[PDB]
Design a protein around this ligand. Structure first.
Ligand code: CL
Ligand code: CL
Lengths: 163, 164
């Protein structure tokens, strides 16, 4: 039931890296399916998040699981699928990869100053702390330079789904 | 924690009535948020479908819960949220309504002739119209939109209805 011709792109990166804005535009340009993963967070996680707490590994497990099922669902009937999901850790990425050999990552990149100077500084401090940038041991990960205008980021995102 | 200034629109109707393609154009045209409900079925249902097995109320219960949750999550940070769900039974509509007084439906409506032919160009269909319970006078949060129009026409009509 995996359609190896079909593909899922997880747009990943810290909060404020413009993930949603990119995925939406790219998806309209490409007529792709699009799922903002924030929406799948379980009520508990949002309470915690909204209250001002940063989540941990076990808060995210059930969420990542939910993204995994939705990628599977989406690759059934869409040639190209986009999922916004921060996927900060390598272990989280692995959870998304399971049973999804046709799923890969677009890492919308930038460092602390760019992002901050793009915009709660603390939230942002903790994301970068949690971020584990994917090394040479993750073959299915492409990177986009977000130190550019939205339109250029979208286009680089496009040239990478089409490369 | 519902936010009454924000609103969720669920596009209902039988498969082939164009739900997803309409929602996308509207969502993009309105900088609105958009969730195609099909993507939230559990593995369970998706494996079943892969086996040409058409679902019953039970397969749908957890799917509909998941949707209800997404609706709520979506309305935290979006003035306008769009969700695609065929939602043919009244009981499913109420299942979406729970805790979401701020969610209504856009019933994308057309006779069988009109959807039949959209499908051929892409049995379940007859069955579908069969399962479809049309929302009566007692469902007050239901707007209807005629789909025997050019898609741009249908898109324009769904926006008209949301701005009402
Ligand atoms: Cl972001
Ligand atoms: Cl449809």
């Amino acid at each position: 039931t995996t359609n190896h011709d079909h593909h899922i792109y997880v747009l990943m990166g810290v909060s404020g890296s413009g993930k949603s804005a990119v995925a939406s535009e790219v998806a309209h340009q490409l007529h792709a399916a699009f799922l903002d993963g924030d929406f799948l967070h379980p009520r508990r996680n949002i309470e915690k998040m909204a209250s001002g707490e940063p989540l941990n590994d076990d808060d995210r497990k059930p969420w990542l699981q939910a993204l995994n099922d939705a990628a599977f669902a989406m690759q059934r009937t869409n040639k190209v699928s986009l999922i916004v999901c921060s996927a900060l850790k390598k272990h989280y990425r692995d959870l998304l990869r399971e049973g999804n050999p046709n799923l890969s990552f677009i890492y919308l990149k930038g460092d602390f100053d760019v992002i901050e100077s793009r915009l709660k500084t603390q939230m942002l401090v903790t994301q970068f702390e949690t971020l584990q940038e994917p090394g040479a041991d993750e073959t299915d990960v492409l990177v986009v330079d977000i130190d550019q205008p939205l339109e250029g980021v979208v286009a680089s995102t496009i040239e990478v789904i089409k490369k």
